Amino acid sequence: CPTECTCLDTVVRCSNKGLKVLPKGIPRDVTELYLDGNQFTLVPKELSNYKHLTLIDLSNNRISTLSNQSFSNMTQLLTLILSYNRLRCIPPRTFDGLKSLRLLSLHGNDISVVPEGAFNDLSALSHLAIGANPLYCDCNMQWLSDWVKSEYKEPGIARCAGPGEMADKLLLTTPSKKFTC
Amino acid sequence: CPTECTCLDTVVRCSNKGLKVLPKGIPRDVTELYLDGNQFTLVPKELSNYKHLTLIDLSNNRISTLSNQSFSNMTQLLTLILSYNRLRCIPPRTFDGLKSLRLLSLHGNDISVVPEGAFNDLSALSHLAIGANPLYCDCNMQWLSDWVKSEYKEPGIARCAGPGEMADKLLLTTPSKKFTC
């Protein structure tokens, strides 16, 4: 078990420890990894190397960018929590391969645009949190409006920042035809 | 259509209009009612006259209290959004009768206690939002840990404020055995 962490029952906790680098020597069999409340600015490239990992909590960090390699090779991942970071741009293939992912939180970031096709591989995703973001509700967000409107995937919290008449309207219930360019 | 609102084919919006009481003249056939961003202090009991109403949005109001009586007669309701209000605790029968409810948001309140049985009749509930609440995760909250663990319902935002070591711990994955008195 890393010095900075506690390890119990394949669950590894390194929460609120002032970390900006992944602790060395995390158990190979880790299933739940809690890195909330630290000072990471990037997703560590190594998280891909933990082949049993089904939950990642990186909430309340300083993460400003993702790469198309960030969650690569994580076909087993169930829960991905990126709440309360500094995300804005979401690379189009960031979530590729994540065919087991059920829960995704992007709530509390600086996101205006989620590119179409970003959820192409996310066929098991049942619960999206994407509130507390300045969503720009033009035709480029129309696909997401349609996506959340099947089986209550977003909880009526996320709202358009704009433009114009879209101001303060819920992502969930606003008709997809109103998302125009 | 109320003077304080805009209406389109059974959807009635009265958002950000400085209201503290329901506008008079809500059409009898209303299906979605948006009262977000006003100064309501209670859920109006007269909402139960509108028998086709399946979505109520009361986000961003000043609701400090619910009654066991709040949602009497409103059996058809599918969505109830109470985000960003002043709620401290859910009375145990406040959601009785809401057997069709799919989505309930209590996100962004002051809730420390949700009493056992509050979700008894919520057998259709598939998405709960209860993040940004100072949840007090003692034995009186163990049932809620078990409830969110029983099925995929909550995307990993809800957190314990306490007691003690329970501070900052996720409701979703923190073992129910830790919810003690």
Curated annotation (Swiss-Prot), chains A, B:
Residues 133-181 form the LRRCT domain. Glycans are attached at residues 68, 73. LRR repeats lie at residues 29-51, 52-73, 76-97, 100-121. Disulfide bonds join 1-7, 5-14, 137-160, 139-181. Residues 1-28 form the LRRNT domain. This is Slit homolog 2 protein N-product. It comes from Homo sapiens (Human). The gene is SLIT2. The chain holds residues 727 to 907 of 1529 of the full protein.
